[PDB]
Structures are given as structure tokens and as C-alpha cells.
Design an enzyme around this catalytic site. Structure first.
Site, PDB file in Angstrom:
ATOM      1  CE  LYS A  18    -105.810  30.543 -56.982  1.00  0.00           C
ATOM      2  NZ  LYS A  18    -105.904  30.228 -58.700  1.00  0.00           N
TER       3      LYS A  18
ATOM      4  CG  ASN B 107    -106.496  32.609 -66.722  1.00  0.00           C
ATOM      5  OD1 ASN B 107    -107.286  33.044 -65.678  1.00  0.00           O
ATOM      6  ND2 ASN B 107    -107.376  31.845 -67.416  1.00  0.00           N
TER       7      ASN B 107
ATOM      8  CG  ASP C 179    -109.917  29.759 -68.863  1.00  0.00           C
ATOM      9  OD1 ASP C 179    -109.865  30.104 -70.052  1.00  0.00           O
ATOM     10  OD2 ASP C 179    -109.988  30.242 -67.163  1.00  0.00           O
TER      11      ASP C 179
ATOM     12  CG  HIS D  50    -112.828  40.885 -56.242  1.00  0.00           C
ATOM     13  ND1 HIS D  50    -114.417  41.268 -56.256  1.00  0.00           N
ATOM     14  CD2 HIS D  50    -112.178  42.041 -56.513  1.00  0.00           C
ATOM     15  CE1 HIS D  50    -113.970  41.961 -56.421  1.00  0.00           C
ATOM     16  NE2 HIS D  50    -113.527  42.693 -56.446  1.00  0.00           N
TER      17      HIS D  50
ATOM     18  CE1 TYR E 120    -110.095  34.175 -56.798  1.00  0.00           C
ATOM     19  CE2 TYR E 120    -111.090  34.907 -58.363  1.00  0.00           C
ATOM     20  CZ  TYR E 120    -109.425  35.359 -57.384  1.00  0.00           C
ATOM     21  OH  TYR E 120    -109.033  36.328 -58.014  1.00  0.00           O
TER      22      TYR E 120
HETATM   23  C1  LIG Z   1    -101.480  33.693 -56.363  1.00  0.00           C
HETATM   24  C2  LIG Z   1    -101.988  33.007 -57.869  1.00  0.00           C
HETATM   25  C3  LIG Z   1    -102.099  32.082 -57.794  1.00  0.00           C
HETATM   26  C4  LIG Z   1    -101.920  30.534 -58.719  1.00  0.00           C
HETATM   27  C5  LIG Z   1    -101.612  31.058 -59.870  1.00  0.00           C
HETATM   28  O1  LIG Z   1    -101.617  30.496 -60.835  1.00  0.00           O
HETATM   29  C6  LIG Z   1    -101.847  32.197 -60.064  1.00  0.00           C
HETATM   30  C7  LIG Z   1    -101.466  32.945 -62.080  1.00  0.00           C
HETATM   31  C8  LIG Z   1    -101.979  33.525 -59.164  1.00  0.00           C
HETATM   32  N1  LIG Z   1    -102.080  35.152 -59.740  1.00  0.00           N
HETATM   33  C9  LIG Z   1    -100.379  35.896 -59.215  1.00  0.00           C
HETATM   34  N2  LIG Z   1     -99.131  35.309 -59.235  1.00  0.00           N
HETATM   35  C10 LIG Z   1    -101.034  37.305 -58.813  1.00  0.00           C
HETATM   36  C11 LIG Z   1    -100.444  37.750 -59.845  1.00  0.00           C
HETATM   37  O2  LIG Z   1     -99.079  38.270 -59.029  1.00  0.00           O
HETATM   38  N3  LIG Z   1    -100.650  39.674 -60.525  1.00  0.00           N
HETATM   39  C12 LIG Z   1    -101.803  39.538 -60.855  1.00  0.00           C
HETATM   40  C13 LIG Z   1    -102.970  40.673 -60.516  1.00  0.00           C
HETATM   41  N4  LIG Z   1    -101.896  41.442 -60.393  1.00  0.00           N
HETATM   42  N5  LIG Z   1    -101.891  42.992 -60.446  1.00  0.00           N
HETATM   43  C14 LIG Z   1    -101.090  44.303 -60.427  1.00  0.00           C
HETATM   44  C15 LIG Z   1    -100.137  42.562 -59.885  1.00  0.00           C
HETATM   45  C16 LIG Z   1    -100.643  41.984 -59.801  1.00  0.00           C
HETATM   46  C17 LIG Z   1     -99.479  40.509 -59.840  1.00  0.00           C
HETATM   47  C18 LIG Z   1    -102.964  36.917 -59.698  1.00  0.00           C
HETATM   48  N6  LIG Z   1    -103.069  37.808 -59.937  1.00  0.00           N
HETATM   49  C19 LIG Z   1    -105.096  37.205 -59.624  1.00  0.00           C
HETATM   50  C20 LIG Z   1    -105.893  38.301 -60.296  1.00  0.00           C
HETATM   51  C21 LIG Z   1    -105.205  36.344 -60.017  1.00  0.00           C
HETATM   52  C22 LIG Z   1    -106.012  35.399 -59.816  1.00  0.00           C
HETATM   53  N7  LIG Z   1    -103.805  34.905 -59.063  1.00  0.00           N
HETATM   54  C23 LIG Z   1    -102.800  35.240 -58.812  1.00  0.00           C
END
Ligand SMILES: Cc1ccc(O)c(C)c1-n1c(N)c(C(=O)N2CCn3nccc3C2)c2nc(C)c(C)nc21
Length: 291
Positions: A74, A173, A168, A53, A56
Site C-alpha cells: 500500500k 477490512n 473500523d 485504490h 488514501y
Molecule cells: C497492503 C496492506 C497494508 C496494510 C494492511 O493492513 C492491509 C490489509 C494491506 N492489504 C493487503 N494485504 C491487501 C491484500 O493482500 N489483498 C486484498 C485485495 N485483494 N484482491 C485480491 C487479492 C487481494 C489481496 C490489501 N488490499 C487492499 C485493497 C487494501 C486497502 N489493503 C490491503
């Protein structure tokens, strides 16, 4: 045409967000009935945990009622402020799609808007490279570092070949795959050179201070990303330390344990002059970075 002057400057039905072309904006799923007041997101997914979180919005681990498979979604925190805010948020989908299928890029499954909220559904990854290093509690072993550097370079080569700049690149990321792989994600700031916002100051290429945007910027950011994870070194957001890292300085207190080979590659990536800095293609051609 002109964002900031729209007629009706001032939607409870979901609409697919795509710049690819399919023509069908209408969303459907098992578990979803548009006559019930819950959102498409509420009705079409089991939310399993909050992955992250911030300002955004939020990211949830979910199971799709469509296919029973795990995804990350997201969502934006609040309804669009207006058409510029909407256009800026939707542009993430356009960038994400423009990237494409690449095994070293987080894959977007679908995106939609409803009630002025934007939802991006991607593959469920492992933790961020930042989270990985926090769990590790120390410098990553170089065997791990080489694999993550290669993967993120493959991702940058894919963007850069298409005139795209991520802007970024940082441990937060980059997301772990299985088997010591990783993927570049968060295409929110990506720009197309020669078409139409700033990355994390800790990783910013020095030429950006003068607004000199290019693919070389991403190579510098990945340089400091790898330095950080390889040396368990906190990067300054400013002051003398920030300047030194942009003048070819490698602090001996943090970097004395680097292999000559990893040091040599970081020096090419951290070259202050964007015209002398190695390209992702050039780095991937080095025998030290193959297979
Ligand atoms: C949803 C999304 C849309 C666009 C996009 O470019 C990205 C990279 C994502 N995206 C994922 N696929 C995440 C994820 O898949 N995880 C990481 C955090 N985490 N912790 C345990 C397992 C996980 C698995 C994810 N996590 C966070 C906190 C953010 C901000 N975006 C994430």
C-alpha cells in the site's frame, strides 16, 4: 513533542519506518541502486496488478526482487501535507507492529517512506470478505460464517487484551486466507485506550455517537459485519434503519434463515449497551465457537 509548531515546518532517500527498534533506517535490495532516480519501490519490486485504490493511495500485488515472493504494498497517494499528516500516516505502522504476529491479523513485512510517500508491505492475502461476498453473489453459508466470525474474534481478542481498539471492523477490512480462514487488517484507525477519527458509519457502535470509545465498539462492528455477510444485507449509513440495528432489531426479511445458534451469537454482539455486550474472549469460550 508538539505536532503543528515544528521548526522547519516546511526526502528522495528511502527510510525504514518502524517503532519496534532495529536502528537501520537504510533500505537495500537486489535491483536497487540509490544513484538511479527511480524510487526504492520502483526498483525493488515487480508490480503485477493494482489490488485497490482510493483517496488514501493504491495497493499493488508485487513480487519482491529480494526473495522472489508475492506481497501486497500500500502506498500513499501524495507527499505528506506536513508533520501532522506524516505522524498520522506513520502511526499506522506503529499500530500494525503493536498488533504483532497473530495468524488472524494481516502481517506487516516492512514499511518505508521516500519523497513523502509511505509504503507498507504486507503478506499478500486473498480478497476482502466484502469482495468474497460480491463473488459469492448471495448470503454466505453459515459453515463459512462461523469460521470468519471465529478468526475475526481471535484477532479482536488479541487487540483487546492489549487495550487496542480497531474502530473500523467491516467486510472491506477483513481478508481471506487459505482454507476458509480470514485475517483482520487496516490498522489505520486503531487507538490505544488511554493514549493520544471515525470508522465506517454503517458498522459504528451506538456508544461512539457520544464519543464513548472501548473494545466493545469492535464487537458491535463485527456483529453487523457478520449480519451483513450471513444475510447478504446492505447496512444503512443513517436514518431509521441505522437506529433500529442499534436498538436490537434484526429485520425478519433478511434474518429469518439464520440458525438459532448464529442469531443468538449476533444478539450478544449487537447488544446496544456496551457494558452488557459480550467480549471477544467471552464469545470464543462458547462451545458453538470452538475448534
Ligand atoms: C497492503 C496492506 C497494508 C496494510 C494492511 O493492513 C492491509 C490489509 C494491506 N492489504 C493487503 N494485504 C491487501 C491484500 O493482500 N489483498 C486484498 C485485495 N485483494 N484482491 C485480491 C487479492 C487481494 C489481496 C490489501 N488490499 C487492499 C485493497 C487494501 C486497502 N489493503 C490491503
Amino acid at each position: 513533542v508538539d505536532l503543528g509548531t515544528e521548526n522547519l515546518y516546511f526526502q528522495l532517500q528511502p527510510r525504514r519506518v518502524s517503532f519496534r527498534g532495529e536502528a537501520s533506517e537504510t533500505l537495500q535490495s537486489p535491483g536497487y541502486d540509490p544513484s538511479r532516480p527511480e524510487s526504492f519501490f520502483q526498483q525493488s519490486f515487480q508490480r503485477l496488478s493494482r489490488l485497490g485504490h482510493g483517496s488514501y493511495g493504491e495497493v499493488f500485488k508485487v513480487r519482491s526482487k529480494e526473495d522472489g515472493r508475492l506481497y501486497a504494498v500500500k502506498r500513499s497517494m501524495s507527499p505528506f501535507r506536513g508533520p501532522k499528516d506524516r505522524a498520522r500516516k506513520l502511526a499506522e505502522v506503529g499500530s500494525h507492529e503493536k498488533v504483532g504476529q497473530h495468524p488472524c491479523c494481516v502481517r506487516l513485512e516492512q514499511a518505508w517512506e521516500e519523497g513523502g510517500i509511505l509504503y507498507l508491505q504486507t503478506e499478500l492475502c486473498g480478497p476482502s470478505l466484502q469482495q468474497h461476498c460480491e463473488a459469492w453473489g448471495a448470503s454466505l453459508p453459515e459453515a463459512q460464517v462461523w469460521g470468519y466470525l471465529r478468526d475475526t474474534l481471535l484477532a479482536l481478542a488479541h487487540l483487546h487484551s492489549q487495550g487496542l481498539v480497531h474502530l473500523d471492523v467491516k467486510p472491506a477490512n477483513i481478508f481471506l486466507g487459505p482454507r476458509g480462514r480470514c485475517k483482520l487488517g487496516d490498522f489505520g484507525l486503531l487507538v490505544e485506550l488511554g493514549t493520544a477519527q471515525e470508522g465506517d458509519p454503517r458498522y459504528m457502535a451506538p456508544e461512539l455517537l457520544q464519543g464513548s470509545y472501548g473494545t466493545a465498539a469492535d464487537v458491535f462492528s463485527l456483529g453487523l459485519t457478520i449480519l451483513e455477510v450471513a444475510c447478504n444485507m446492505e447496512l444503512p449509513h443513517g436514518g431509521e434503519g441505522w437506529q433500529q440495528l442499534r436498538q436490537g432489531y434484526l429485520p425478519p426479511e433478511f434474518t429469518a434463515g439464520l440458525s438459532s445458534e448464529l442469531r443468538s451469537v449476533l444478539v450478544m454482539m449487537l447488544e446496544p449497551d456496551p457494558k452488557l455486550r459480550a467480549t471477544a474472549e467471552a464469545l470464543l469460550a462458547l462451545p458453538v465457537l470452538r475448534q
